Subunit: 274 residues, 4 copies
C-alpha cells in the first residue's frame, strides 16, 4: 500500500516503495533517510519558527527539500514507518555527550519500533553520529551500523546508547521507554531553539550521509568529507556565496521554495553573527 505522503517520501528518498514492515525494510529506509534528508539547524539561526505538525514537516523536509533536527527528522520518519505499517512511537532522551555535571532535559527525540516480536530503536535526527540502522534493545551486544559500532545499555530503567570511538564507548544520550506527546516535542523544540545557551543557536550545523560509510559535515564554514569513518578532505569555505552553493551541491538543500526557502543574503546575516 501507498498513501499520498508515503509517496513523496519515497520520492525524496530516491528509493523504491515498500509495503511490508520488516526489519529489512527498516534497515534500508533508515539509511535512505540518512542520505536524502540532511540534518540542519538553519531555521534556528535565521530566526524562523519550527512547526512540528505532519504537514509542516511534509512541506519542509519533502517538498522544499530542506533539513531539520531531532524533532523534525524523526517526526517525518515516524510518519513514514507508520504509514508503511510498522509499530512506532517517539521517545525523548537526554544528550549526555559533553559529559554534563547533571542530567540535561529531554532534548532528543528518537523512535521505538516493534518489528518481528522484538524492539528496535531507529533514530535519524541525532546529527553527526546518528544511527544509520535500527538497533535491538539489548545491553552489551556491540551492534553494528553502516557508519559505526554502538552499544545500548540497560542501566536501571534508562537505556544508555553509546558508541565506539578511539578504543572505548562514549555515551551519546540516555532515555527510557516512557510515552511522549506532540507537545512534549514542541517543548523540546522550544528549548533547543530558544534557550540562550543551546548550542544550536551558536553555529550552523549540517550533516548528510553517503552510501559507503561516508558522510558530509558542515559547522559554519568548516566543511568535511568522510569515508569509511575517516576524514578525507577538509575544506574551509571562504565566503557566504560559496557556502550558499555548497549547501545546494553537497547537501542538496532546497534553497528555493515559496515558503521554506531562503535568500543567500539571509544566509549572510546568519553567518554574520559569528
Amino acid at each position: 500500500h501507498m498513501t499520498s505522503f508515503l509517496h513523496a517520501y519515497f520520492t525524496r528518498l530516491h528509493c523504491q516503495p515498500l509495503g511490508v514492515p520488516t526489519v529489512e525494510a527498516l534497515r534500508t529506509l533508515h539509511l535512505a533517510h540518512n542520505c536524502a534528508i540532511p540534518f540542519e539547524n538553519l531555521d534556528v539561526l535565521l530566526p524562523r519558527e519550527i512547526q512540528l505538525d505532519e504537514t509542516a514537516l511534509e512541506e519542509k523536509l519533502l517538498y522544499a527539500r530542506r533539513g531539520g533536527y531531532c524533532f523534525e527528522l524523526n517526526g517525518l520518519f515516524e510518519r513514514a514507518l507508520r504509514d508503511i505499517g510498522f509499530n512506532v512511537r517517539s521517545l525523548l532522551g537526554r544528550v549526555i555527550l559533553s559529559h554534563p555535571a547533571s542530567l540535561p532535559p529531554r532534548t532528543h527525540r528518537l523512535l521505538l519500533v516493534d518489528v518481528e516480536d522484538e524492539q528496535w530503536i531507529a533514530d535519524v535526527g541525532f546529527g553527526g553520529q546518528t544511527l544509520t540502522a535500527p538497533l535491538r534493545l539489548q545491553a552489551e551486544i556491540a551492534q553494528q551500523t553502516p557508519h559505526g559500532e554502538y552499544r545500548l545499555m540497560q542501566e536501571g530503567s534508562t537505556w544508555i546508547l553509546q558508541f565506539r570511538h578511539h578504543e572505548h564507548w562514549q555515551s551519546m544520550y540516555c532515555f527510557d521507554l516512557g510515552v511522549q506527546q506532540q507537545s512534549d516535542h514542541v517543548m523540546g523544540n522550544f528549548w533547543s531553539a530558544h534557550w540562550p545557551q543551546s548550542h544550536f543557536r551558536h553555529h550552523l550545523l549540517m550533516c548528510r550521509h553517503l552510501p559507503d560509510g561516508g558522510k558530509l559535515t558542515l559547522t559554519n564554514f568548516h566543511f568535511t568529507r568522510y569515508h569509511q569513518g575517516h576524514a578525507v578532505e577538509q575544506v574551509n569555505v571562504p565566503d557566504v556565496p560559496s557556502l550558499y552553493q555548497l549547501l545546494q551541491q553537497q547537501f542538496g538543500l532546497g534553497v528555493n521554495d515559496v515558503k521554506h526557502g531562503f535568500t543567500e543574503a539571509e544566509l549572510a546575516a546568519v553567518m554574520a553573527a559569528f
Copy 2:
C-alpha cells in the same frame, strides 16, 4: 533537628519548628506554606529570569518575602520537607484545566511524599485551586482539604487530580510517578515564562491562602476575597499605586530587597502592557 535553611523557613511560615516527619507535620506545614508564601508570576511579566537552585529560591521566597509558581513554590517546599526528614521528590504533570484538545507539556511541578508507609502528594504551587493539604495516592476516595474536596482518578499508571464544582468532579491536571531532574524543571520554567502563548505572560497573578477556608486572589486589577470557598467582597483596584500597596498589604509581598524587589514604577510598566 534544624538546618540553617529550615530556620528562616519556619520563620517565614510564622510557625513553630517541627523535627518529626509525620502526616500531621505535613498537614500543617502545607497549610502554613499556603498562607505565608504567595503564588505570584511577577518575575515573568517584568522581564526577569527565574532561577530554581536552592539559594535563589531561598533568597526570593524567604528573605525577600516574594512569591512564585509551580517550580519555585514546590521547589522550596521540597527542600523544607527534605531537611525535616521526609522522603520527597518532585513530579511533573500536565495542566488539563482548560480541557485541551491534546495533552499539554509537563508544565506543573508537585511533590510526592512517603509518610508512614503510604504515598501522598503535596502541592503548594498550583495557584488558585492548589491543594492545601496532602492527599493519599488513591482513586475515587473523595479526599478533603481545608479549602476544597478532591478526587484522584487512576487511568492506567498515570493519575488525574480533580475537585468538586457544581456537583461534578473536575480534573485539574494529570501526572505519573516518573522521576524528574532539576533540568526538567528548568525546562518547565523556561516554557511557562517564555513560550509566547503561555498565559503567565499575559496577566498578573497572585493568590494567597487564609486560615479559615479563605483566600485572596488578584488577576491584574481584579482583587477578590473568599471565605469558606465563597466570593466575599470583590474590589477592582483603580490604579497602579493603589495596587502596589495592595501587594504588600494583602499578600505580604516583599516589595523591597536589594535583589528581588521592584519599584512601583516597574509595576506600572508591567500593567501598562495590558
Copy 3:
C-alpha cells in the same frame, strides 16, 4: 506610467491607475489604502517574523491579502507613492497616546510627502485613529479628514499631531523631520514585536476602513462597526471558528496562501493565550 508592483497595488486597492502625483491623487490613494489593506498585528501574536523589504511587503500585503502595522503598511504605501512619482521618505515618531511619563522610543513610522511645493504627512499605519487623508505640515490649522478632525501644534523642530476627541484637542503622537533608514524601521519593528511590554504582544488588533466615515474594529473577540465616527453595533464574537470567519468576511484577510496564510487552529492557539 505603471510598474509591475504599482500594478497589483491598484489591483488590491480596487482602484483605477494614477500616473500624475498630485494632492488629489494622494487624497484618494490614502483612503483607498485605508479601506483595502487592514491594520493587523497577527504575525506578532502567532510567533512569526516580520520582514520589511519591499517583496516581503509585496507578498504579504498584496498577494496574500494580509495586513500589517506602522512599518508594513506605510512601507508598502511609501513604495507605491514613489513608483507613482511622488516625493516621499518615511519618518519615525513617538506614540504618546497613553500620555506617558517620559517620551517613548520611535515606534511609529509615517510618511512625508512633497506635493505641489508643500509638505504633507500621509500615514496609513496608525491603526484605530490613523489619518485617512494627507495633512499639511502647519500648526493650529484644524485639518479635516474623512474620519476625523486633526490639528498640528509646535514645540521645537519636532512635530506633535492631535485630533479633537471628547469635546476638544489632545495629542496623538509626535515626530520630527529627521531622515530614517531601513534598519531604523527594522529596529522599530523589532521593538514593537518583541519588547515584552509592547501591547501588540498582548492582544489581537484589527482595523479596516470604510468609504463613508465608517470603520471596523477588532480587539480580540470584541468586534465593532462605526458610522460617521459612531459606534453602530458591537458584537462579541463567541468562538475561534466564528472569528476565523469574521477575519475573512469583514476585514478581507487572505487566510490562505502558501506563505503568509494561517490555519484556523493557529488562530486558536493565539487566542488561547488570553
Copy 4:
C-alpha cells in the same frame, strides 16, 4: 562641588575629585574611566536584563564593580560629566566596522561635550577601540589619543570616525548631532541584547584599559595583553574556573554582590553555549 554620586564615581575611578569642567578634566576622567570600569557584555549572555536608569547604572558599574557596554558605560559617564558641571548629551551612531552593505541601526551611544566654546565627543563605551580621550569635532585633523590615532571625517550631516589599522584607516562607527532620548537608548540596548544576529549574544567580551597605552582583551577564552598598542602575551585560558579568576584579577570584576554578582557555575553555563 561633589554630589552623592560623583562621590563613589571618583572612588571607583581611583581618582581625585574635580569640580571645574575643563578640557583637561575631561581628558583625565576619560582615561580614568577607561581603566577603571571595564567593557563587558556578560549580562547579555547569562540572560539578565540591562536597566539603564541612573541607579541601576550606579549599582552595577560602581557598587558592584561590574562592566557594561555602549549604553551603560557612556550613560554613567554622562551623569558624571553632568554632575561635574560639563555640558553633555548622548548621541547615537551606527557601527560600520564590518563595512556593512547597508547602514545598520543606531546601536552605539556616545557623548557630545561642550567645553570652552568647542565641541568634543567622548566615548568610553565602544570596547576594543574606544577613544581614551575627548576629540574635537573637526574633519581631517588627525587627532591623538593615549591608545591610538583617530581621524574623524565629514560627508553631509553625518560624521564618520576611524583609527590607524594596519596602516590605512578603518571606519568604525558614525553619527549625527541629533538629540536622543532615554527610550532611544533603551531600544538600542534592546536591539543589541536581543536581536538574534547581534554579535553580543554569541561570545563573551571584555576589555579594560591600562595607563601606558596598554589594554586587556578577553574574547571567550582568548585573553590578550597590549602595550603601546602591541600584542604582548596572548593566553588562552584553559577552563571556566581559571577564567572566573581572570575576570576578577585582570579586569577587576566584582564577581559578588547581592544583586549584580554571578556564581562561577553561571559563567560555566554561559561558556558552555559555545
